[PDB]
Symmetry: D2
Subunit: 444 residues, 4 copies
C-alpha cells in the first residue's frame, strides 16, 4: 500500500527537477538518482525492446562493462550537424543534456553571475573550448588576424589561440606591489596600433596562479564595448570563487563580455575533459554551439548531472564556503611557516584562490635548491604545489617565454604556489605544511 | 598454494599485453580485465593513499558513483599543452592511453591497412577530428583557403571544413550506372583552376551510403602526390570493411594519404564521441596530436580498451566475418522483397556496407508516400533505414544542397537505405524485412 | 513521444510477471530486470525518503558497496514469527520473496514434477534444509527416533539427520550389474523390525555419484504410504534431470512423498548457500516454513530471481538440453578413452548425470596409482573428477563407513567419476579428456 | 616510478590484515578494499583461466549480474563435512571466511568481551543460530528435555528452543521499580524442581525492549556453574553496548557462559540474515560449527568484512560513541515531551539501548488510543517505535502469553518504545519527536 505511494515521493522530486530545471537545494539520495537515470536511458532507441537496426550508428555495444558504466547511454549528444538538437534516436540523452545545461546555468547564477543568459556543456577541455570560441569568431570577423592576450603562463589557453589559427598579441603584465596585473595602457595601445578590424578579440583570464591576479575585466569590458571588439574570458577555475564571478558579472554590467569558459573538472570535481561555454547574449552562445561539427560524448554531462544532483545547491554552497575557510587557513599557516623561514607570503589580495610564498632564502644559482625543492615535494606525495624559479625559458608553438610560469620576464624572486581549490580538506593543508617544512629544512 | 600461482596466470597475460602491445587473440575474461584496470588506476596520484593536494586540478571527485563508473580514472589524458605526453600526476592513465592507441593500431593493420604507421584516439567525434586535421594543415600551408571535396551528404564532415575556417570546393559526383563516383576530371580541373598553393587538401570519403560508393582513393592519392597536395580521408565507418581498408592501403601504396579518420562508436560498438586519427608518416600524425590544446577525456579510450581486450582480435575478426555474411543476407532478402514490389536493388557493387532499393513505385508527388514510408519505419521501431526522396533542398553553414542525401542534384529515383554495419544480427534483417513489407503494403 | 511509450514496454513484462507469477519464456533484458528491482527496493522502509527510524532493526547500512551490491535490499525475508510472512517494514523484500518462490515453483513443474503443490526458497544449503525437515517431523512424531536411509556417501545429507538429533539407520545398497540400487527388502525389514512409530521418516536420494543411481522412489513411496511413514527425498541436484524429476513425480503418483529438497546453486548456477523445499501437501510445506525461527537472508532468493528472469524458461530448457547432450558426448568420449587403456565405462544407465570409468588396471595395492591419478588431475586443474580406490575408511559423526565414496562396503573395482552438470561446455569435456589421457600415460 | 611504489602501499595494508587478523584502526579506501577482494576471488577454482570442471558443484554462474555483485565469490564457505574447513576448490572463499571470523573476534574484544575465545559467522540469523546451539547441546545431554528461559517477548528467540526440539520453561520476571528483571529464585527453583540432567541449558537475554533489562547474567553464570548446566546467552543486538558486553564479560568471569549469539545486521549495519556465535570454550564453539551440515552462504561474511574494513575499528568506535550520545539525547527529548502530556519516562537505567514512555493518559479501554497511536506513527513513517497496550494476548507455537510485548503478565501501564541503535542520527530523534507530538495531539 505504502509501496506505490513510496514511488510517488521520488517522482515528486523528479518532476520538480524537470519542470523548473534548477538544482535541488539538498542533494538527492542515490536511489532517486539511479531511478532517474534508468528512466532516461530506457528512453533511448538503442534500449528499446525488440528494436531492429539497419543503420551504421545504432548504438550497439560490444561489452556489457561499457554499457553499464555509462548507465546504458550510448548515442551521445546532439545531431549530425547541430550539437544542441534533440537526437531523434536518443530522446533520453537529449533530455539528459538539456537538464544538465540547465542545472549548470542555475549554479553559475548561484556562484555570482546572476545575469548569465545561456550556457552549454561541451565535451572538450577548456583549451579546445576556447578554440571553438575563436573558430566561431573567425566567421564573424573575416579581417581579424590577432588575439590580444594579457599574459598568463598556461600552455593550453595560449595554444588555443594558435590552434584556432590566429596570432597571439602578448600583452605583458604590470607589477603593482607584489601583484602582476592587466596593463590597460598597453592593451588599448595595441587596439589602436592594429585597429579594431584586425583584432579577433581580447582574451582575458580570471582564475590563475598568484602572483598574477584576475584581469581587470571591468576596464577591458569597457574597452571592448567601445571599440566593438569581442571579449572572451578564460574562467578555467573561477566558478568556485565569488570574487572571480562577481568580477565577470560587473564586467557584463559596465561593458562587453561575449563568452566566459570554465573547466568541469576544476569547478565540479569530475573527471577531466569537459567544459562550459557561457554568455550574456543568447544568440551568440547558440552560434558557438552550432559551430561544433557532429555528435559529442555524453560522458562529461552525465558526470556533472550526477555530481550536482547528489550535492544539491546547498552541498555546492558548502564546498564553496569551505574553500573560503580553507583559503584563510592555508594563508595563515603559510604566514606562520614563512616568517619562521625569513620568507614571506607575497601580498596578493586580488587573487582569491592561489597564494605564493617567497623562496628568496634559496641559493638556486650555486646548488639548484628552488628546483631541488620542486621534485622533493613531488616525491614526498605533495601535488599541486608549483615551484617557480627565476629565469625560466620555455617555447610554445614557436613563441618563447622568458620567465615562464611567473607570467612575466623578470619577477623579483622565486616563489612557491599553493591554492585553496574546491573540495580541499584541512588534512591537505596540514600535510602540505608539515611536508613543506620537512622539505625546506633539507635545502636551507 | 595454487592461490598465488593462480595470480601468475592473469599476470602472464597482462605482461603479454604490455610487452608487445597487440590485441589478445582470444578475449580476456572480465576478471583479468578488471584486475588490469584497478592496477592501472591505483597508479594515478589522485588514488594514492595519504596524498595531499594544494593544486587546482587534483582529480578530486565529489560523487562515488562518478569515481566508480570511470574505474577511478580522473585526470584524463595528456599534459597542459601536449595530449600525447605522459601525465606526471597520472602514470596509470598515461599507460592506459599508450596501450589503447597501440591496440587500435594493431586492429587497423588486422583490418587491412598493414602499413599504417601511427594513430591516436582523440575524444572528439569524427567531424571535430577532421577539423583538427585542417587546423593543423593551416599552419603548414599559409596560402591555402580551399578544401576540395567529392560530395557526400553528411552534415558533420561538411561542417568540419567550415568549422576549421576553410572553404569547401564541392566536386559533384559522376553517375556511372547506378553508382555515384569520384569525378576525377573535375577534381584535377579545380587543382589547376585554383593552384596547388591555394588548396589546403583534398578531402575524400570511403564509407558512405549507397548509391554513393567509396572515392577513388588510388587516383586521388596519385593526384595529391603529384601536385604535392595533402590528402585527408574520411573513413568514418570504413574500418569494418575490407574493401574500404584495402582501398586506403592501395592509396598509400601508389600515392599520397596524409591521414585517415575513423569513428570509435561506428567501428567498435562503444558510446559516441570518440575517434581515431591515423596515418603513414609518423611525424605528421604526431603534429596533429600536438595541435590539440589541453587535457582530454580518457573515457573514449577506456571504452575501446575495454572493448578490444574483451573481444580479442579473434572476436573482432568474427564480428567482421558476420558483417560480411549479414550483408549478403540483407542483399538477398532485399532482392527478394524488391522484385516482389517491382522495385529493385540498385546495383552498387563498389559499396560494401550500404545498400539501396528503388522506390519508383511510390507516388511522392500526389500523396507524399516516399516520405510517409519514412516516419512509418521509424514508428514501427526500425532505425537506420534512411529514406531518400527526390528534390531535397537543405542548407548547411550557408551552402544549399540540391537533392540532399542523394549526394547529387538529380538522382534518377527515390530509394531506401539499409546497411550491414558491425554487430548486426540476423534478427535485425528479418525484423526489418518483415516490417518493411508491412510498411510498403500500407503505402502502395 | 517514442520515449514514454518505451517504459510501457518494460511495464508490460513486469505486469505479466506479477499477475501470473510464471517465468518469462524469453529472458528479460538487463534494463528491464534492473528497473524492476529498483522499483521493489524503493518499497522497503529503509529506502523511504522521509523515514525516521528509532528501532533496533532499521535496515541501516554502513557501506555503500554493501548497499549497492544487494540492490538496497536490506531487511531480509519474513518476520521473526514466520519467513512466509510479509514484512511491514519491507514490502519490496516481501514481494521479492513471493515472486521468487513462485518462479521456482514454475521451474519445478517445467523440469518434470508437474504436480508439485508448494515450495519455498530457504537461505540454507541442502543439508540444513533437510535438517529443517527432520526438525519439523519431530513435533509430528514424538515417538520417532530413527531415520531409515539407503546409503549414499555424501557427508552433508548424512550429517543432516544427526544434526536434527535423530539416529540414521543405514541401509546398504544392492549390486546389480555395475549399479548400486536400493535394497527394498532390507528397507521394509527395518521398518518391521523397529516399528513405524519409531521411524521419523525414510530418507531417500535421487541425484548421486555413479555407480550409485537414484533410489527406487516408486517402491519407497509405496512402502512409506502403507506403513504411514514420512518420505523425505534428497534431490540436491536432480532438478536438472528429467529422469530424476519424473522419478519424483512417479513416486508422488503411486505412493507417498512428504518433501523433496534441491540445491539452488547446483541446479541454477548461482552461489552456494540456498535451497528449495517442495512438496505435495501444501499444509505440510507451510509447516516446515513456519518452523524456521526469525528473519532470513534474501541474497539467495535474489540470485535465483535474477537468474531465472535473465534466462527465461527457454534459456533454462536450453541449458537442460545442452546438459543431456554433453552427457552423451562425455560418455562416448570416455568410452573411447577407456578402451585405449583397457578400462571400460561402468554401465550405469539409471544415472543420468554421473559417469564412472574403471581403474582396474592401476595397482593401488602396489603403488598409489589410483590416489596419484586424483592429485594429478587436481594439479592439471581438472575439478569435479573424483577418484575412488577400493577400501576407503571414513568416520563421520562417529559412524564408520567401509568403502567410503563408493556407497558400498565392497565394490568390484576402483573407478573415476565425471558428470555432465548444467552449464558444462564441450571445452570442459575436451580439456578433461586430453588431461586425463596425459595423466593416465604418466602414472603408467 | 611513483606508480609501482603505489601498489606497495595497498599491499602493506593487506599484508597487515593477513598477518595479525585485526581490524584496521582507520578504514580502508575502497580502492584497497576492492583490490583485496579481487585478489581473493581469483584464488577460487571457478575463476581459474585454464580450469575445466566435470563435477556437480563447479561454481558455474549463469548471470554476470549475480557473478559481479558477489565479487565472483561463488563456492560459499566450508565443505559438506564442516564449514570451518578449507574448500580445496575455493582457497579465496576459504580465506575470506577465516579473515572475517578473525575481524569479528577482534571487534567483540573491542566492544567489551575481551576474554572471548572463539567465534564464527554463520549465515543464519540469530534465532536459527540459537537453535544450532541447542541442537549441539542435545548430543551432549541425552537426558535433557527442558530449556529454562527468563521471559522476553520476541518470537524468534522463543521459537528457537521449540525448533531445536526442546520445551521452554518460561520464567516470569520480577517488577522492580519500573524495570522487569530476572527472577533468580524462581530460576533456581525450576532447576531444583526438574533436576539438572533434564535441563538442556539456561537461556538468557541481554539486549531487549524496555521496561525489560538485560538478565542478571552474573547470578545466572553462578547458578549454571554450580548445577553444571549450560548457559546460552541471546545477545542479538548487545555488541553495540558496552553495558551488555561488560555484563557478558562479568558473567564469564564469575560463572559459566557456554555461548552468546549476536545478529550481524543489528550490530553492523549489514543486511539481515547472518549471525555470530561466540564462546570461551574453544573446543565447544568448534563443536557448534562442526554440527552444521554442508556448505553455507558467504554473502553475510562478505558484507561484514567489507563493513569492518571500510569503517576500521576507529569508525566502529565512533558509531558506538554516537549511539551512547543519541541515547541521552533521545532520552532527554522524551523526558521533555512526556511532561507536556503528563506522561513520564519510565525509569529503566539498566537498559542502555531501549526507552519507554508511559501512555497512562490514553483510554485504550474506552477508545483504541494506544493502538491508534501505533498505526498513526506508522503512517507518518516512524519506524521502530513500538506501542504496548495492557493485556495483549499472543499464542506462539501453542504457548500463550498474557501481556505479550510487555515481557510480563500484568504491567502497570501502556507505554511506547524507542531506541538508540547504531547508526541513528539526530534527525531521526527530531523527526520522531516532532511526529510523536503531532500524533499525541491528534489522538487527544
Ligand atoms: C558518422 C559520420 C561522420 C562523423 O560524424 P560524427 O557525428 O562527427 O562522428 C562523418 N561522415 C560520415 C559519412 C559519417 O557516417
Ligand atoms: C586548466 C586551465 C586551462 C584549461 O586547461 P585544459 O587542460 O585545456 O582544460 C587554461 N588556463 C588555465 C590557467 C587553467 O588553469
Ligand atoms: C533480533 C532478535 C532476535 C533474532 O531475530 P532474527 O530475526 O532471527 O535474526 C532474537 N531475540 C531478540 C530479542 C531480538 O531482538
Ligand atoms: C550437494 C549435496 C548435498 C547438499 O550439500 P550442501 O553443501 O549442504 O549444500 C546433499 N547430498 C548430496 C548427495 C549432494 O550432492
Amino acid at each position: 500500500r505504502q509501496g506505490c505511494e513510496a514511488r510517488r515521493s521520488h517522482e515528486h522530486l523528479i518532476r520538480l527537477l524537470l519542470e523548473k530545471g534548477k538544482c535541488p537545494e539538498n542533494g538527492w539520495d542515490e536511489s532517486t538518482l539511479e531511478l532517474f537515470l534508468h528512466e532516461l536511458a530506457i528512453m533511448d532507441s538503442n534500449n528499446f525492446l525488440g528494436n531492429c537496426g539497419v543503420g551504421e550508428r545504432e548504438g550497439r555495444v560490444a561489452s556489457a562493462l561499457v554499457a553499464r558504466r555509462h548507465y546504458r547511454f550510448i548515442h551521445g549528444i546532439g545531431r549530425s550537424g547541430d550539437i544542441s538538437a534533440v537526437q531523434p534516436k536518443a530522446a533520453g540523452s537529449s533530455l539528459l543534456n538539456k537538464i544538465t545545461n540547465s542545472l549548470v546555468l542555475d549554479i553559475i547564477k548561484l556562484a555570482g553571475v546572476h545575469t548569465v543568459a545561456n550556457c552549454f556543456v561541451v565535451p572538450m577541455a577548456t583549451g579546445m573550448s576556447l578554440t571553438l570560441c575563436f573558430l566561431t569568431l573567425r566567421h564573424k570577423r573575416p579581417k581579424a588576424k590577432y588575439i590580444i592576450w594579457p599574459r598568463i603562463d598556461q600552455k593550453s589557453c595560449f595554444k588555443s589561440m594558435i590552434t584556432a589559427g590566429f596570432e597571439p598579441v602578448v600583452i605583458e603584465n604590470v607589477l603593482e606591489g607584489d601583484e602582476l596585473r592587466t596593463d590597460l595602457k598597453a592593451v588599448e595601445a595595441k587596439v589602436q596600433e592594429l585597429g579594431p578590424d584586425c583584432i579577433l578579440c581580447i582574451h582575458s583570464t580570471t582564475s590563475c596562479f598568484a602572483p598574477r591576479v584576475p584581469d581587470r575585466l571591468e576596464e577591458l569590458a569597457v574597452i571592448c564595448a567601445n571599440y566593438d571588439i569581442p571579449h572572451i574570458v578564460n574562467n578555467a577555475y573561477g566558478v568556485q570563487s565569488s570574487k572571480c564571478m562577481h568580477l565577470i558579472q560587473q564586467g557584463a554590467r559596465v561593458g562587453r563580455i561575449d563568452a566566459f569558459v570554465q573547466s568541469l573538472d576544476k569547478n565540479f570535481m569530475v573527471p577531466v575533459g569537459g567544459a562550459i561555454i557561457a554568455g550574456f547574449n543568447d544568440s551568440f552562445i547558440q552560434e558557438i554551439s552550432k559551430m561544433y561539427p557532429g555528435r559529442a560524448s555524453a560522458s562529461p554531462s552525465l558526470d556533472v548531472l550526477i555530481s550536482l544532483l547528489s550535492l544539491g545547491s546547498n552541498g555546492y554552497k558548502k564546498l564553496l564556503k569551505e574553500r573560503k575557510e580553507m583559503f584563510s587557513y592555508l594563508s595563515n599557516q603559510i604566514k606562520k611557516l614563512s616568517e619562521a623561514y625569513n620568507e614571506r607570503l607575497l601580498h596578493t589580495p586580488h587573487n582569491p584562490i592561489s597564494l605564493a610564498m617567497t623562496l628568496k632564502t634559496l641559493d638556486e644559482h650555486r646548488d639548484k635548491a628552488v628546483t631541488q625543492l620542486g621534485s622533493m615535494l613531488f616525491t614526498r606525495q605533495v601535488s599541486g604545489a608549483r615551484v617557480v624559479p627565476l629565469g625560466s625559458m620555455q617555447t610554445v608553438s614557436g613563441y618563447t617565454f622568458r620567465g615562464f610560469m611567473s607570467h612575466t620576464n623578470n619577477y623579483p624572486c622565486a616563489y612557491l604556489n599553493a591554492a585553496s581549490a574546491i573540495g580541499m580538506k584541512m588534512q591537505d593543508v596540514d600535510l602540505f605544511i608539515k611536508r613543506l617544512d620537512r622539505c625546506l629544512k633539507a635545502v636551507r
